[PDB]
Amino acid sequence: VLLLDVTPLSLGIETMGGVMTTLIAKNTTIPTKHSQVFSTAEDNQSAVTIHVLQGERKRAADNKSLGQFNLDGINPAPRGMPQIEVTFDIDADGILHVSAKDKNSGKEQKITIKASSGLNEDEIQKMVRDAEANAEADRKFEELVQTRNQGDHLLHSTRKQVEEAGDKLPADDKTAIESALTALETALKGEDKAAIEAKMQELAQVSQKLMEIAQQQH
Amino acid sequence: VLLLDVTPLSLGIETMGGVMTTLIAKNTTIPTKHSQVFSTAEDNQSAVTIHVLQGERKRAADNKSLGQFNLDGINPAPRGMPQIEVTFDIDADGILHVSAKDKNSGKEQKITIKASSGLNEDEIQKMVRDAEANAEADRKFEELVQTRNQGDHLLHSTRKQVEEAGDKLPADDKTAIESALTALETALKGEDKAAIEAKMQELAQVSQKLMEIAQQQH
């Protein structure tokens, strides 16, 4: 062939922390269909937002927004337990269909995005340059988001484990641990990567008895 | 400058499933130091293996091995709870130091890798070509590893939640759910991505009562 139609920019979704997670890489040949499985961030969460993005930046708000929809009716479950399968499907016509299916509830919602959507060529090449210029800033934002989500998961798990421990956990431990979850939860509200790790570290340091009781539980 | 020393290949570690996780990207200028935080895969796991790799393939066994060491003395904890911080540090001399520090125990182990280690230029360019040729196979392996780890996490969480539920969970639910965990645990032992999702899906479908009881618990 003298010609290929390829994706000039990556296509994906915004995930927790405001990051673009790619489903279809830049320069993938049409037609194509990719899927990935995602979950909820909170206990009892009943819907997820699917924000569809085009571009090469690690920050979602720095990419082009192609549209957004929600899938609701997610049944009550602990966070990270629902299986929401997101499929990006680009047909031979260059039309993108993005669906999300809850594998428990069977419920599905879809957005369809015309082949003329998104960034025009001047913007496309502006985007490839901006991604290139900014590899450092975006790497730093990617690592901060990944620390913050780890801190959140640690925040959430340790609270659950305090719960299932109840009386097994000595008075002094619970006080040290709860003090740490409060400062951790504070730190999570800033942009200081070292401060979040310092609060996560304090928590690892005071939670050793809890960790044993939780390991022993199961 | 007329000259830069840059990393000719990515440098990283093997993570769960046999995948290379990068800490220092290809073409990063020396000197440089990057860190990322990782955890255990099993309840009560007392050590982690740090296998250091050079190259651009998503499969660890397809990259160059620069060495390997363990950090032990990890105190008993539920999986995913220990914070093992891995730092890749390349000094002005092109020497790589890779340390792992347990933030709870304070324990640290290190390997130091001379600037002459790893792949020579012919191998370097053979590696960039092989990565390039194989983007599809590696993407497929990356998605299979990510499904398998999700299935494992779901396997493990649902068992824990069966536990903390005990009598709250009706007889019929526990039987349907345990049948599913057995087939899920079977599927995890193959290489069939669809079969693992089908078993994870069966589990989402029978666990709805459990998910409510677990959500209600906390």
């Binding site: 979704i13 915004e14 995930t15 927790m16 922390g17 405001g18 997670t21 499985v37 995602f38 979950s39 909820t40 961030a41 909170e42 969460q45 009943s46 819907a47 997820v48 937002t49 699917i50 924000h51 979602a60 929600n70 966070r79 990270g80 929401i84 997101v86 989500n149 | 999700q150 996490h153």
Partner: peptide
Amino acid sequence: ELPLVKI
């Protein structure tokens, strides 16, 4: 009501 979580 929240973006998806990369699991």
